[PDB]
Amino acid sequence: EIEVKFYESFSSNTEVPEHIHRYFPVYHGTMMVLENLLAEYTKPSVMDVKMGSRTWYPDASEEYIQKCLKKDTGTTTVSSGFRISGFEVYDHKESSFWKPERKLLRGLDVDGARLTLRKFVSSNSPDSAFASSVYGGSHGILTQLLELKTWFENQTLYHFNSCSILMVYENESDARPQVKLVDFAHVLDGNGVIDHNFLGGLCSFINFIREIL
Amino acid sequence: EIEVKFYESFSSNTEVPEHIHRYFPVYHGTMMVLENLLAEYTKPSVMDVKMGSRTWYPDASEEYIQKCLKKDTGTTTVSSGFRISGFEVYDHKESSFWKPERKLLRGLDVDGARLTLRKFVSSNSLPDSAFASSVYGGSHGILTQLLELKTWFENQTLYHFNSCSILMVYENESDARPQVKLVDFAHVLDGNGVIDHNFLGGLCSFINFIREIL
């Protein structure tokens, strides 16, 4: 429940450069007051990915370490740097949003994950593409993810444990695609040590996106 | 026992750019026959680091996963990308190599590691100096070398380097001719179109420690 200490610390932290601040929910203070990200979107497809080569962290209690451990087992969390935990997507041919039960997404394997990452940018639901306008492009997801990556290569302020990337874009017919980080229940001071566990996963994820382009 | 199949595969494999091959013991066939790296060094200080946010891997057996899982706990392996497994260094004041027991380094914490990595480039081991600018830094130094590998590890999905060490070495003789290489390929596997994120993570933390030091 102490997302608060994070936002308190992070939002005012002037050592984090401004172009990286923009990946984070705007904090208005505190009973907690946060910008809704999806507020500017009309018909948005949205996906949330759990970043991290492991979900746990050494400093967690014993009960919460063994918990995360068995959760990770059999997901793409181990095999790849990350885990697709939910999406919701708009089919243009049927004029409708669909959104699979989240339990079901736990069972995805490496091909499963690549397929789904493509569905995310298809009009179907054989997979088409908005890939060039969501993932690709000079202002798309791949570029944004890269900007993030650069930062994670150097920043030693925070360790983002158990924490998720969020992708979203517009369907209403630009795609206006965006990346954000969410879930800070477990962020810790990375005491002069880069968040390698995240950086690991981020890079893997980046490669998946790049395959597709 | 199958470093063989890897060498056989890696040494031929034509998808590895050629400026990367130079970070791997040269192979010559087979009872195995491999260029020894240290041959070119008169008085070398050397260090071997276990790369990896974890040591084990999913495809390993159960006995072997629980083994490493315990081994990892309480070492910079989990905290940082990696784990200094051993080194041997040449104090120029006492004209003498020394080299601490391997177990002892298993106890190192983050500050320990940052110190050790700085010892590794000093003339003192008796407050630490620097050959840091000529081993680590410089346009052909370890930093540049570690960076080249990083780039590569961002893209390459050919091999997963399970449970596998980086080796640094350099010349004490009175330049320092610093060099990086990867060793131990008993557990390599086909990265089935998935980068070696575990390694890449480690390498990146490692790259940062060394960058601090400059």
Side-chain angles (χ1 to χ4, degrees):
Chain A
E1 299 227 67
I2 49 91
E3 258 186 277
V4 199
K5 296 216 168 162
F6 173 71
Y7 283 112
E8 279 303 346
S9 177
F10 186 83
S11 52
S12 75
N13 194 338
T14 185
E15 223 179 308
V16 178
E18 277 297 316
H19 72 273
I20 296 299
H21 267 292
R22 93 177 269 267
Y23 288 94
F24 292 84
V26 167
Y27 181 71
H28 296 102
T30 179
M31 174 52 63
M32 187 165 41
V33 179
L34 290 170
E35 133 182 75
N36 183 320
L37 328 152
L38 309 183
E40 316 109 73
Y41 291 84
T42 281
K43 281 174 208 322
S45 287
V46 50
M47 169 190 263
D48 84 295
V49 193
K50 212 169 224 176
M51 289 309 181
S53 184
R54 42 142 207 269
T55 294
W56 43 276
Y57 49 89
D59 297 296
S61 46
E62 185 53 16
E63 275 196 8
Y64 181 85
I65 267 165
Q66 203 61 334
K67 189 173 171 156
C68 294
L69 197 123
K70 273 199 170 171
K71 256 184 177 149
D72 294 8
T73 309
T75 69
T76 65
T77 286
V78 188
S79 83
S80 329
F82 61 77
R83 210 204 330 204
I84 286 152
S85 42
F87 63 89
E88 193 206 31
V89 159
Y90 182 73
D91 184 303
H92 293 238
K93 188 179 175 55
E94 310 269 340
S95 299
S96 190
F97 294 92
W98 78 289
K99 158 168 105 181
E101 154 174 34
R102 292 171 88 90
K103 255 278 182 76
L104 194 74
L105 290 183
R106 290 277 191 245
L108 275 175
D109 73 0
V110 166
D111 293 326
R114 198 180 285 95
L115 188 72
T116 298
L117 273 167
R118 207 188 290 271
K119 281 175 154 174
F120 186 66
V121 278
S122 315
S123 45
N124 317 105
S125 277
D127 308 308
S128 40
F130 304 110
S132 179
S133 44
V134 165
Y135 295 156
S138 74
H139 285 95
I141 299 262
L142 174 69
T143 290
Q144 274 161 57
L145 280 180
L146 281 184
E147 212 175 36
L148 264 159
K149 154 162 162 308
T150 295
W151 188 66
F152 269 83
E153 287 178 335
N154 302 260
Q155 86 87 11
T156 55
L157 313 173
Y158 309 88
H159 290 173
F160 301 82
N161 298 123
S162 283
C163 158
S164 309
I165 264 163
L166 185 136
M167 295 189 293
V168 50
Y169 64 85
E170 183 80 70
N171 297 271
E172 201 71 10
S173 290
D174 54 307
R176 203 149 69 65
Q178 259 160 14
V179 180
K180 306 265 165 181
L181 273 62
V182 300
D183 302 29
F184 307 110
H186 295 257
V187 168
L188 274 151
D189 295 307
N191 286 305
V193 175
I194 69 155
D195 186 355
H196 50 84
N197 170 64
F198 199 95
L199 184 48
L202 181 50
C203 288
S204 192
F205 195 77
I206 293 194
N207 191 251
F208 273 79
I209 298 292
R210 204 155 40 196
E211 276 209 344
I212 291 182
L213 283 177
Chain B
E1 295 270 69
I2 53 99
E3 278 185 280
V4 180
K5 284 205 182 180
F6 167 78
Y7 281 119
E8 280 300 1
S9 173
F10 185 93
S11 31
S12 76
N13 176 325
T14 179
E15 220 152 321
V16 193
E18 271 265 346
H19 76 313
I20 290 307
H21 277 267
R22 83 180 270 270
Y23 290 112
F24 290 81
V26 177
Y27 187 53
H28 302 271
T30 168
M31 174 50 93
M32 202 155 62
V33 169
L34 300 149
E35 160 228 34
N36 174 297
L37 348 165
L38 298 184
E40 303 149 48
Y41 290 92
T42 288
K43 290 175 190 323
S45 298
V46 58
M47 178 196 267
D48 79 291
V49 195
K50 221 130 191 174
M51 282 290 157
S53 193
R54 59 158 189 277
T55 278
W56 42 284
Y57 50 95
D59 304 306
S61 51
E62 184 54 32
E63 275 205 7
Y64 183 85
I65 278 161
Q66 276 302 339
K67 183 170 189 156
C68 301
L69 184 137
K70 216 159 204 165
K71 252 173 179 160
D72 284 356
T73 299
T75 79
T76 52
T77 270
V78 174
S79 95
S80 321
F82 60 94
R83 205 204 323 191
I84 299 167
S85 281
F87 64 94
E88 172 188 37
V89 149
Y90 174 69
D91 186 308
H92 294 238
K93 199 167 167 58
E94 322 280 353
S95 294
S96 189
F97 301 87
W98 76 289
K99 152 220 270 177
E101 155 171 15
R102 291 184 94 64
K103 278 275 192 68
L104 197 76
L105 297 172
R106 254 152 174 72
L108 282 183
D109 68 8
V110 165
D111 282 322
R114 178 146 45 245
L115 181 83
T116 302
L117 277 172
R118 196 188 307 264
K119 275 175 164 173
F120 180 79
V121 281
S122 314
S123 48
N124 335 112
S125 287
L126 167 72
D128 327 323
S129 28
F131 304 114
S133 162
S134 48
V135 174
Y136 285 158
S139 79
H140 292 56
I142 296 214
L143 189 57
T144 302
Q145 292 173 42
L146 283 185
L147 283 174
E148 276 190 346
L149 274 152
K150 171 188 149 216
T151 292
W152 186 59
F153 269 85
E154 303 197 295
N155 315 127
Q156 84 81 16
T157 72
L158 307 159
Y159 307 93
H160 285 163
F161 289 96
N162 295 162
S163 197
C164 169
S165 305
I166 277 183
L167 189 154
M168 309 186 286
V169 51
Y170 70 91
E171 191 71 65
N172 292 277
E173 209 70 6
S174 281
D175 71 307
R177 196 137 66 70
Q179 256 167 2
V180 176
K181 291 211 156 46
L182 271 57
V183 304
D184 296 320
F185 305 106
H187 300 260
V188 170
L189 286 148
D190 295 303
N192 285 329
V194 180
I195 71 167
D196 197 345
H197 52 84
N198 163 72
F199 200 89
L200 177 56
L203 182 64
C204 282
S205 188
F206 200 86
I207 288 201
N208 188 255
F209 272 75
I210 287 167
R211 225 165 89 214
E212 284 261 324
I213 295 178
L214 295 158

